[PDB]
Amino acid sequence: SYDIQAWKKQCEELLNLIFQCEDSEPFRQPVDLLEYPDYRDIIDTPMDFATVRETLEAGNYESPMELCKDVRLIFSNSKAYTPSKRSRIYSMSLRLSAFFEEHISSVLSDYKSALRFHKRN
Numbered sequence: 001s002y003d004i005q006a007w008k009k010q011c012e013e014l015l016n017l018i019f020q021c022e023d024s025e026p027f028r029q030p031v032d033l034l035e036y037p038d039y040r041d042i043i044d045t046p047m048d049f050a051t052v053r054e055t056l057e058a059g060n061y062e063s064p065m066e067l068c069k070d071v072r073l074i075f076s077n078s079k080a081y082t083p084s085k086r087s088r089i090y091s092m093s094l095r096l097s098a099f100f101e102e103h104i105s106s107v108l109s110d111y112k113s114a115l116r117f118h119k120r121n
């Protein structure tokens, strides 16, 4: 299964499934500084799923590893900002992260396999 480009549509479909999850709603759009005015004191690099989708559609990811790094930043930002590991929004982040990791595993493996096949000779 050695298509070097297949990861892009596979990531588009996974982002579609994440946008259907009720657990994504806090992470769809960049955090609101008016409601969370200390947010940028704690978080150096904001990230959200609309930015990830736009970066993918613009043709500004070279690999699914780069996309996976930006999605993992959404989750590390939620863990760094939570005032409590028992909070609603952080709790939603941990369920969404498990879902994402379960689905992205084979996208990464297939891409890396396809690049090794390309370099086989």
Ligand SMILES: COc1ccc(C)cc1NC(=O)N1CCN(C(=O)c2ccco2)CC1
Binding pocket: 025, 026, 027, 029, 030, 031, 032, 035, 036, 077, 078, 079, 081, 082, 083, 087, 089, 090
């Ligand atoms: C309902 O969400 C929205 C609706 C509409 C907009 C425009 C933004 C948000 N996100 C938003 O306000 N967030 C709060 C701060 N975050 C955290 O990860 C976190 C951990 C513990 C408390 O917050 C990111 C998500």
